């Protein structure tokens, strides 16, 4: 017969292995395929779809109130409205999104993001806003004259309901890393901030307060690697009715 010898790793069970294995049911014919709508083949197809940011993550906001930001007319110029942390692995406004949930099964990420905002005031309401992205290095900006030195777009309300801000990929390394430290030079993305460019101006029969909905998605330059167990789910016990499967 053939002379042979056994290597280190013989008989081990590795959960990421890929081999053929013995069929239980010989000569079995599986059911024919038919066309079904909406087939998916790479998870990067799902990550390109817009989903809502939870920007209003505050103690007083309950349920659906957390998915919108309310804005109103101001007596003073150049004022800050809100800001968003961009750390897409950590708990925060971006986490419960299609891009956030899928990314938390992986450890490294790369590529550009888009934020889109929709205005939901009356037809008679008017205003202008400035949306800014600041690259990392120090504290989040608190004044319009500091923030406007970064990447930004100035938005006019009108017949088109919505505006997109691109967050471009700006990094020293090819990938950023989902290490458990928000202040690491391998992890921090910088900040998004929003200011009044003019004022929210409305007539007496419109509501005095109007709402923004914010959305996020990845562009097609996006990439993910090094898969892991997701931290978004867990158990300390067997579920209800799990014993009945043995009885």
């Amino acid at each position: 017969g053939v002379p042979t010898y056994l290597l280190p790793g013989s008989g081990q069970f590795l959960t990421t292995d890929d081999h053929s294995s013995a069929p239980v049911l010989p000569c079995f014919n599986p059911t024919p395929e038919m066309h079904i709508p909406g087939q998916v083949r790479n998870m990067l197809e799902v990550v390109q779809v817009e989903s809502m940011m939870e920007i209003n993550n505050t103690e007083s906001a309950v349920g659906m109130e957390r998915l919108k930001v309310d804005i109103s007319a101001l007596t003073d110029v150049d004022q800050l409205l809100f800001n968003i942390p961009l750390d897409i692995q950590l708990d925060g406004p971006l986490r419960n999104t299609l891009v956030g949930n899928i990314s938390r099964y992986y450890t490294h990420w790369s590529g550009s993001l888009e934020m889109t905002f929709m205005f939901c005031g009356s037809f008679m309401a008017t205003g202008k806003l400035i949306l800014c992205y600041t690259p990392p290095g120090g504290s989040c900006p608190t004044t319009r004259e500091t923030a406007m030195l970064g990447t930004h777009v100035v938005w006019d309300f009108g017949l088109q309901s919505s505006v997109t801000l691109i967050i471009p990929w700006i990094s020293g390394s090819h990938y950023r890393m989902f290490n458990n430290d928000a202040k690491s030079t391998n992890a921090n993305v910088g900040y998004v901030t929003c200011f009044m460019q003019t004022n929210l101006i409305v007539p007496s029969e419109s509501s005095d307060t109007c709402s923004l909905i914010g959305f996020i998605a990845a562009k097609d330059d996006f990439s993910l690697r090094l898969m892991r167990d997701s931290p978004d789910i867990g158990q300390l016990d067997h579920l209800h009715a799990a014993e009945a499967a043995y009885q």
Partner: protein, 237 residues
Amino acid sequence: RVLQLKLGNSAIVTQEAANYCCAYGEWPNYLPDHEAVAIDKPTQPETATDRFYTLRSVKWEAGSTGWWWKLPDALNNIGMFGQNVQHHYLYRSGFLIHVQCNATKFHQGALLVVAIPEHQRGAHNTNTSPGFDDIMKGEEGGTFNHPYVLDDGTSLACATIFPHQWINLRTNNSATIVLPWMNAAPMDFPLRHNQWTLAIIPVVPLGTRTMSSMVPITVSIAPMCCEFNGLRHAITQ
């Protein structure tokens, strides 16, 4: 033996050089599109940044252990280079270094001039790592505690594996080194990592029997092929 260097609005001439060194046989260049990562159009200032800056001079004395400076940290507050560093998240460049020291035909002494990539320092006789103020000296630089072990527990005797020249006072009065970009990444954040350390070590001490005089050592450095990305508001050390 004779050399002229011309960059931007600055020029240096020397009548007693000894060739010059190109680290690992390379020359500085801009980042090509097949190695790039950040997608924004880069700032490239040319003659505003790519010119000689001269640091404070230091005195060579009978007890001197030697001196060091870290790059880019020593230049992060100087001229239009310092302004571009403070307004951008990312930087990249090479460097051209010129070290100057002269004395009479009756003096003797020798300096090793060496450029060390990733010179991570150690502390002496303790388990605790060096602090931020031990490392980040800026334009003043620092001095060696134990030059015989390069302050890292290796040795001075083998330091000739790095890009280097000598100043030997009977032979020459200047040393010149050209440094490429030297990092694991195509660009970096200039306020927290140093690519290169310049070190000057007196292996044979200064001596004479003629009239005493103060003998200074002077360092001039020029950035080459500077690029900056990720424009924002100004941030300092």
